[PDB]
Each structure stands twice: as C-alpha cells, then as structure tokens.
Curated annotation (Swiss-Prot), chain A:
SUPFAM superfamilies per the UniProt record, alphabetical: Alpha-L RNA-binding motif (SSF55174)
UniProt-recorded name of the protein: Small ribosomal subunit protein uS4
A GO MF term: rRNA binding
Family in the record: Belongs to the universal ribosomal protein uS4 family.
GO CC list: small ribosomal subunit
Covalent S-S links between cysteines: none
GO process annotations (BP): ribosomal small subunit biogenesis; translation
Superkingdom of source: Archaea
Naturally occurring in which organism (per UniProt): Pyrococcus furiosus (strain ATCC 43587 / DSM 3638 / JCM 8422 / Vc1)
InterPro entries assigned: Ribosomal_uS4, Ribosomal_uS4_arc, Ribosomal_uS4_CS, Ribosomal_uS4_euk/arc, Ribosomal_uS4_N, S4_RNA-bd, S4_RNA-bd_sf
Swiss-Prot record, chain B:
Record's protein name: Small ribosomal subunit protein eS24
Naturally occurring in which organism (per UniProt): Pyrococcus furiosus (strain ATCC 43587 / DSM 3638 / JCM 8422 / Vc1)
Domain of life from the UniProt record: Archaea
PANTHER family: 40S RIBOSOMAL PROTEIN S24 (PTHR10496)
Family membership noted in the UniProt record: Belongs to the eukaryotic ribosomal protein eS24 family.
Gene (UniProt): rps24e
Swiss-Prot record, chain D:
GO CC, alphabetical: small ribosomal subunit
Tagged with keyword RNA-binding: yes
MF terms (GO), sorted A to Z: rRNA binding; structural constituent of ribosome
The name this protein goes by in its record: Small ribosomal subunit protein uS12
GO biological process, one term: translation
Signal peptide: none
The encoding gene: rps12
Portion of the full-length sequence here: 50 to 145 of 147
Curated annotation (Swiss-Prot), chain E:
Membrane-spanning segments: none
CDD domains referenced in this protein's UniProt entry, alphabetically: Ribosomal_S8e (cd11382)
Keyword terms: Ribonucleoprotein, Ribosomal protein
Protein family (similarity comment): Belongs to the eukaryotic ribosomal protein eS8 family.
PROSITE patterns: RIBOSOMAL_S8E
Protein name, as recorded: Small ribosomal subunit protein eS8
Amino acid sequence: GDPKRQRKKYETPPHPWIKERLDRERVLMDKYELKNKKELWKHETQLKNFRRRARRLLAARGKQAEIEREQLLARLKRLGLLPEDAVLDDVLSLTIEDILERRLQTIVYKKGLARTMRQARQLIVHGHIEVNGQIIRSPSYLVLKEEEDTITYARTSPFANPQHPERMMIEKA
Amino acid sequence: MEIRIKEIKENKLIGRKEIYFEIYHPGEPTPSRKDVKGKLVAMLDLNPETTVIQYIRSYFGSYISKGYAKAYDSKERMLYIEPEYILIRDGLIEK
Amino acid sequence: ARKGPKRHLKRLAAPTSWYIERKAYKWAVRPRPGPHNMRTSIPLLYIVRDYLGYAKTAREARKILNEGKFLVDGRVRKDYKFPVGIMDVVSIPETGEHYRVLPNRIGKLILHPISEDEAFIKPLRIRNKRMIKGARVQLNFHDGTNHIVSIAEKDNYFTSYTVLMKVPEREILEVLPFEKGAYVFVTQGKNVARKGRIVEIKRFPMGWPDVVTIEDEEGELFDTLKEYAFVVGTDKPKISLP
Amino acid sequence: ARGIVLEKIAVEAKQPNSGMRKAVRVQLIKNGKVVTAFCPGDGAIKFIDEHDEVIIEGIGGPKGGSMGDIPGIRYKVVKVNRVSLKELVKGRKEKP
Amino acid sequence: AIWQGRSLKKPSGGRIVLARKKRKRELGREPSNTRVAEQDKRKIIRTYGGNRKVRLTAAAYANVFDKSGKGRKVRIIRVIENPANRQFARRNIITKGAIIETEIGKAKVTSRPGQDGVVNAILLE
RNA sequence: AUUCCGGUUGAUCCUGCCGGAGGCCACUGCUAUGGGGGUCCGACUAAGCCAUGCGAGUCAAGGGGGCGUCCCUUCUGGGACGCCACCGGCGGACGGCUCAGUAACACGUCGGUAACCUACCCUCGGGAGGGGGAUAACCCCGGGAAACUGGGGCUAAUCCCCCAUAGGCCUGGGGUACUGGAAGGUCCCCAGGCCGAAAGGGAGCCGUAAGGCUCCGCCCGAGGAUGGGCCGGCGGCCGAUUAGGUAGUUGGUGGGGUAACGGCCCACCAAGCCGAAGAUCGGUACGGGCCGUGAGAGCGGGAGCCCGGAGAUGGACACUGAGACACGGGUCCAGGCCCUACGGGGCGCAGCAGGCGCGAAACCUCCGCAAUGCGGGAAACCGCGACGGGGGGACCCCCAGUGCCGUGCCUCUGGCACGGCUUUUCCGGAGUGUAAAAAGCUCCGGGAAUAAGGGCUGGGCAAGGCCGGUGGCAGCCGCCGCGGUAAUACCGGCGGCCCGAGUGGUGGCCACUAUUAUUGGGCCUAAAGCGGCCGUAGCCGGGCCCGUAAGUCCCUGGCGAAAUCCCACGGCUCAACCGUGGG
C-alpha cells in the first residue's frame, strides 16, 4: 500500500544514441525551434497516447466504447488535428508534425505576427500575444481551432501600435 | 475602470445583499478598495456605512478583475455577522 | 489502540451520498445519532451552507440555525449536526421555501422544491410493528420515529405500508398499503430514484430478503428489494417525485 | 560505508597486464571489519594517510563484485576527510 | 483477574501467542457459592455498561411452586444432591441444578442465585 | 518498439552465462535563474536516551462566597455591573505519533447475533410526592526543605442519603395479541420473591398578587440512531539437513462467570482432535485499498494518503466512568536518570519544535484559531503544535528564462561590428492579496542589463587518425580490451558529441531473460531419463442412450468505502491540481 506519485508526462528514447533518430530529431528541433528534447518527447508521447487510444477503441465493443470513440474524434476535431469529416481510421495517420504545427509559437509565426520562430517565442514569453482576450505565456500551448482566429497582439503591448519599429519590420515580409 | 454587476442576490436570513462584479480596466494599477467601494456605492445607491468589500481579486494576464462585496440592511447586523478582520481591512473600525 | 467511540470524520471517509468536496479540506461534520441512517443522511450544516448557499462559513450557518430560521419536519432544529434524510421536508418560512429530500439516480441526496400545501405531509414506511405494555400496538417508521395505536386498529397497519403524517401535529392522514399495482419509489440500490407500480413479490428461504418487481411508466420491468420499495401512492403518486 | 585507513598497500595487475595498483586497508566503523579499497586517480594514493577517515563505495563490476584486472578489491574511496577524492586529485580543493 | 478470552491452543494442538494485552471487557468474577444460612445475604455489583447484578451469597428462604403456580416462601434446611459438583452437596451449596428439602418436602432449584439473587424451586412429586 | 547488440576460434555454427542499452526508489561528486501544484523530508541502523517551551479544556442561564465601580434607602441592607478562586456538570477513552510484537478470525469479502452493551442524539407513551446530611470556598491555628498535608467552627446546590408510587429482574401456572423464514422474544391474566427514579432545578417577559407565555432542563418504558463486543464460510509467505503433534487436549452431561454464546472456567464421563492436500516446529513480516516494472502473462514492494489492528522504557495489576485495566491518570518488579536542609520526594517526546547517540542517510526550540473539524456553553463565545500560514531542503510533477530583429564581415551546425526593439527574469515603488505578513496577480521607472553546467570522445554507442607529457611505469578498463620511445584507448590543450537546471558514481527491484518457460524452455553427442521392472495416492482416461444440473455458459437483484486509474466538459493564464458525469 503506497500513495499516489505524480508521473512524468514524456517518455525518453529507448536508446540514447541512434544515428537516424538523432538526425530526425535534430531536423525537427531546428525547424520548430524548441528549447530542448523533452518538449519534443512530450509531443511525441501525446501522439503516442492518441494512437494507443485509437488502437484500443478500434477492437472494442460496448456503449462505453462507442462513447469513448465519439469523444476521441470530437476532441481531435476540436483541437484541429483532424478534419470535420474524419473517421477513427484517420487517427492512425497522424504525424508528429501535425501536433507540432498546433503550438502557439508555430501559429503565431504562421499568422505573420513575427518574422521568425524565435521572435514568436519571445513574444509569447514576454506576453505580447493574447488568445481569446486572455494572455497566454506558454509557447507550447496547443491552440484550439475555435479560437485560432482570435490570436493577435495584446491591446496594451507596444507591438499593438502599427507605428512601432518592430511591428513595421515584421510587416515588411 | 468600468464596473459591470455580473450578479446581485438578496440574502434574507442574513439581512444583506451579495454583489458579484467585474472591473474592466486597460493597463492600469489594480483598483483600490476605497475607490471600488465609492464607485459601487454611487452606482448602486447603497449606504456607505453598511457595505463591505469581501475581495477584489485579479488574475494572470487579464484586464478584468473580479470583485465580491456585501451590503447589509443594519449596521448592528453587519457588526454581528461580519468577522473583525474583514471590517478592519475595509477600515470600518479604527483598530 | 481503540478505547471508545469516534468523534471525528475524515472527508475522504465521508458517505458517498453527500454532495461534498472530498479534497478541499480534511474533516467533515460527524452526524449525530438521529432519525435516519448514516448513508441516507446529511448534517444540516451542509444543507444550510453548501446545498443552499445561505451562509459562507460554518459560523454563519450555526448562527442562522440557532436563530431558529430552519424547520425540518415542521420542527425547528438548531444543532448543525442534525441528520436530514430521505422523504424529509425542509422549510424556510422567512423565504417561504419548501424542499423534499430525495435520492438521485446516482444515489446522492438532493432537494426537490415542493408546494406549500404539500409541505405538511410526510410519508413514513412502517419498518416494524409490535406490541408494548398494555394492549397497544407500536409502529416503527423508516426514520426511527414511533407511533402508537389501539389493538382494535391492529389490522389497519402492516410492515412496508406507508403512512401520511401531518407534521408537526403528528396526525395520521392516510394509509397506503403494499400490494399489486401500488405506486412505489425506490430509495436505494442500483435502481435508486426509479418509480413504477408493483407487479410481483417473491419470498425466499432463511433470512434472505424479499424481492419485488416494479413496472415503470414506459413499461420496463426491474427488480429490487421489498424494503427498498417505498409506497408513495395507490394509482398515481400522491407526492411529487421527479 | 565509512572507515579509518590502517595502511597503504599495492597489488599486481593480472596477466597479461602489468602494473601496480595502489589501495588502502580500511576498518569500517559499522562493525570493525577490515576491507581493501582501491584509490582511483593518477596520484590519489599520496592524498591518503594512515588514520584518515574515508568513505568507500562499491566498485562497478559483474555481479556487484570485483572489476577489471584487480580481483580481491570490491570498493573504491570516494571521499577522504569529508572531501571528494576526485576533486583532490584534479586539484580544485586542498586536503584538510 | 479471571480472564475469559480466547484459548491459547488451536484445535489441532498447536500454540497461540498473544498479540495484545488482556482487555477489561474479557474479565470475569469470582464464583458465588450460595450457602444455606439463617439469614439472606445479598450484594450489588456494577457490571458492563453500568448495568447491575444482585449476588446472593447466603440463602435462607426459597420460593417453591407445585404444578399449579401456587408459590410458597419456605425456609431451606439442607441440600440433598447437586449434580453440578460432587462436593457441593456435602458443602451445602445451592446451585441452579441443586435439589433441596424444605418444610414442605423435596424441591429442585430452577433459578440462578448468583445472577438474580433469588432461590426459586419446583416441588418434587 | 511484442527489438537487440560485445565477448569461447586461425576461421564457422551452437548451448550457456557475463556485460551494455530503459524505468523506478535510497545515498552521494560537480553544479544551480525563477514560478506554481502535491498525500515528500530521522521508515532502513537505536520501539535508543532526553534539557526547556507548548500539545485538553469549557460552563456565571446549577451553588454559596471574596474583591472593585455605581444607583442608593441609609448603621441594617436592595439592585445592577465586571474580576477571582472554590464546590458541581461534561470532556479528557476522540484527535496526534510509531510498526516493536503478531503466520492470528490480525486483515479483505460475504453472511449471523433469534447469544449481546451503548453517555451524547431522535420519536412516541408516562412521572416529578415527603423528608434528611455533610463539606468545599471563607475564618482561627498550623506542620513540612520541598512534594504534600493535620485540627476546630459556619454554610449552598442540578452535591449525597432515606421513605412513597411507578418501573427492572428471576421463577411457576394459564390465553394466544405482534414482528419474523422460523420464537428461550414481545403482549395479556394469576402466584412467590428480590432489587428499586427524579432536578419543576435554572433563565427571560408579563401579571397588584394569584396566575400565565417562552427557552434551556430531570427520571422511567418501547423503539431507533451512533460506536463497539463476539461468531462462521472463503482468500492471501518460505523451510521436510523440521514427520509426527495434542492431554483441557477433542466431544458430552450438570453448573459457575460474562453484557453476551463458548473448555472461558469448574465436577464427572468417554477417546477423541490435527497431519505428506505439509500438522508441529523454525525463519521472516503489521494486513488491505494500492504502488514500481513489463506489450501482456507475470515479477517485485506494500513507511508517507484512507480503512482496520497493536504499542506508549520491558512486564504485571487494579479505581472512576456508557466507554480504559487509560501516551501528557493510578499501584508493584526490572532498567536508567533528577532534587534533597539526608528524614525524604519525582521522571520516561513511538505528540509539535529542539538536543545527544547511531549512523551513507532526513528541517524552525516560528505566527493563528481567520477557513475544516472536535470538546464545553442556551447563546455570544473560549481552547485546540488537530488543522491553517510561513521557514530550511536538488522530495515528486507542471510551465518558463539565461534575449530578439535588420545589415555587413568571417576559420558559416556559429562568432564578430554597427543601428534598433522586449522586460519573461533581477532591482526599486503603488494597489490587490494575507487572521496579520510573505508569496502570487495589475501597473509605473532603469536596463541585455542579473543568470550554464555535468559526463563522454576505440567498438557495443553520437562524437579527433590533431598537437604536447609518460615508454609494462604511471594509469584506464561495467565487457572486449589499451599502455614495453611514432598511444585516435593514460594525463593536459585545442576541437566535437549527448543531455541540459541538470548531469555523473554506488546499492536494490522489473524488462533485457523463452536463463523459471500455463501462454512459453530443455534432457543421444553441450546441464540433465532413476540400472531395470511391479504397484498405492494423485493426474490423465474407448463408443452410444436416458436422468440431475455440481462444474460451465446466458439473464437479473444485494454487495466489493473513498482516494488512486482512463475518457469528456468546466475553474485556477493552458498544464500540474481540483470539480461535474461515464467507465
């Protein structure tokens, strides 16, 4: 009899040094400008959990099984990882890049609010980005589809002024 | 500083009125208890000597600060019900 | 290391029938002995504070209770540890509010608003019947309450019957028998908070409890215990039980 | 474990290896048992004198036993006089 | 005191080791040897939970009933037999199974003098 | 990720083990900028020993007094107002701490008590009649070094005692009125007996009085409710280099005792009872919910949070109470201490802080009853090292920083020069926050300013055929294996590769390991078929028909606490965390 112990939310690679895995992870890190490998492993295990849930639900029968299947599909569609007309089979086709593209940093960069991923990360950390009115300072936050169009400069941040030198530099792109 | 009264309730067992409100304000210091009480009393037509602000709580990276207050019917009832610490904080007793 | 009765109750160990936050704090009110069981009861403090939100602190709740502002079964209750059980009428005259305590579909206790005219009626299931000194018959109800009648009226009451009592005067209004077609309400078990009409009764050897089958409005047949089958009418419920 | 250095000794590397490995004899404070502890480092031996208080720790080897070409030695010195032996040999600290 | 707890031997002949100290609720009392005398002697004992017991140590009168519910208070003379103990008959000790003889003949005890403090008996036909 | 790679040879294929590679827990080297959430922090060795402080109090609406203020009538004395102590009531048997002992009905689950007790609380049906007596406080006088304690007088009660009636128990003879599945139960009528109640006390508002209204009270009976006691079926370690164990032992009859049934005990009658399906004896250990690991089967642990059980230096005993044979109550022995004016008298932190010892191994001698809850009170309210708040700590988990942009140069996975921008974080202020603080959250001012280390570099395994030192010596090496004067393998510099507020070393568990093999291993030559056969328990057993349904399968009621686990939604900025529903 032992009490609860809070667990890690990421899984380390089975072998620290594999050439192909190291090269692939290095490419992903360079592309998405993540701070360290634990963030990438966190997203990888998120994808793994989704895939495991889909695999378990595929071969399950029962009202609870149908409810869980519907909830999984609805949650993925809400997160924006799958189209509206998706099916459970389409879950297994998800890739790490799909999750990486939903990060607040990536969406901020894509929307043209920052010249580069590093600039977007600094903006998020310093609180120049507001999501649905709230200011979120977590670059790894997964933006929901329903609120993807509400991301913009904080109404009090200097970046909100169109005449700001940094804003003009960003717009010059 | 704009105060929006989200909810108002009438407690009759305890002869008071509970007011939940939200203070919207662009970048500015968190409003002081004296200013909040004065504005609330002026807006809602309450007795100044019978209103106690339970709290004015601000959140992370937000321009809306929530606030909870109570307005009693009787000063004696207010003294009998409210604890000493909240009244001292609101400056109703000289301490 | 145990030498006598307990006086405390940890929140994690509180009964599952309470709408309580089991992790906000450590202790919970330990109900005093009273009418109903531990499982089918809740201290009046939680009704005053959590369920209704008339007070924000236990001190305020105790002050209001001591001021005699809350009536249970038509009698003012002042202690904050008084158990409140199923089929109980909670009255707040000052706000003119009247609630009936009933189980939920998941076994939790809830307050169902009732009418002022209906607030004067309490159903009581005859848990037991016996004879006492003299020639009088004593009836023991589900909430531990007792009533006394004469030997002449012995056949007017039986176990599992229901009695409508006018509170606080404690006067008999009507007797609902337990028989086929009698409307019943399930008080606990898997089929709690379900209602229907009696269809069949089954007995078993030794001390095994009786089993009763109930037909619901939609026509579905389910089973439960005779003791769990609470009679609340004859053809249509006389007490609002939604 | 903790112990007191009794004497400093040397052992011969096994065949085909050839060399002197410098160890110490340590008496445990727990029960007074005497064991042999190897001193890791290029010049670790000169940093240990008799009657010195040392901390010994298992030596990484198969089945939690001996290591490399020095069987009969199961422990290595980690700290001498409550100071790290690695730090002393590397030169960032002075032996108290 | 007179412990009345569990036995220390299993039915298989093994040995049991106490896992706890003796508890107060498990204690008994000394036997009450009701003796025939010239005057009744009784005492009051406070028992578990605050209840009460009346212990009769010396018995002089007996309530004897004869097949019709007619009870008589008759003095006890001697104990003829007592199957409970082989020495109680000789020691003149009254017991729930004892047989006595009173002014109106032989009777058999039917009560427990040490538990209710009364000697009741049925006449022998 | 349901996985492999290195090592027996001149070279090959096997068996077999050893080592790498992953997760978790405990110590530990080097190193360290922040914020949140949690059930983390003297469990492993000593359930070893403790200085000092605190951890259980409350009631003036039960009673008589002392002190002080006031209104006074006025030597009298009346009344308010507070403070103090005493008697008196309740509580102190809960909570808090530890895992020593225990292989046991201790624990888990399902049932039984028709064989039993219970203050506090709820309902109903009843009662409160007449007397009597001490003593605390106070006063006089002390004794004793202290700790304690004597004598005399004067008082009150919800203090104590007695009488009376209701009521309680036992037994004998009759009727069957009730609940139950079934009455040694309950109800009614006679008879013999034992035992045997109360406080109409207190407070407020009216009333000329009388009397009235209300609030908290007292006793008995029948039921509940709350907390328990006892009992039964089933379930969960290793040793046969432990094969016999038992004599109140197993059962009976008759009794005693208990609150209760019982060899629990007693008096007699019998020879019963347990055991290779492992008794007895010995080793180890608090049991469970659960946790760690694994794709799963499974293996291993079961200190922190919840439930249950035991203990209060090691034993043994009793008093008061509903409840104890009682951690901060009592008596004796053993063991260790303290004061003494030598006669004598006291103590045991496995309670919160703190100290010694033991060790590889673990923190402040802090603030508050503001929230939750408990005891007391009619209530306001008081106390609570429980709890809540903070302090120290590389306890676990979650979210971030140690800048960004444009141009130009360069030995371009980066560095440098120039011109701009942000303040996460740091520093100084105002609010909000808090029982009061602090931390957090909003805002104002200065400014890239305050912030990167640890191992490794021959393969297994990502990373140098570069330079200097040593020349079987120093040394390295989990394994293979390097070093003997051209060392990619040792030391150092310059480069590089892994992770990153972490990174290394040691012990332990799981996978690796189909090297424990039910899923799922082997036994001709590598470990292993008894030298051979006969046969008892056990295991596995030809075909068809009929019958029962014990196993088996399907459906449906009562259970298997909560927390923990998975899914969806909602609240703290998302998350960690918590709530609402389903599983």
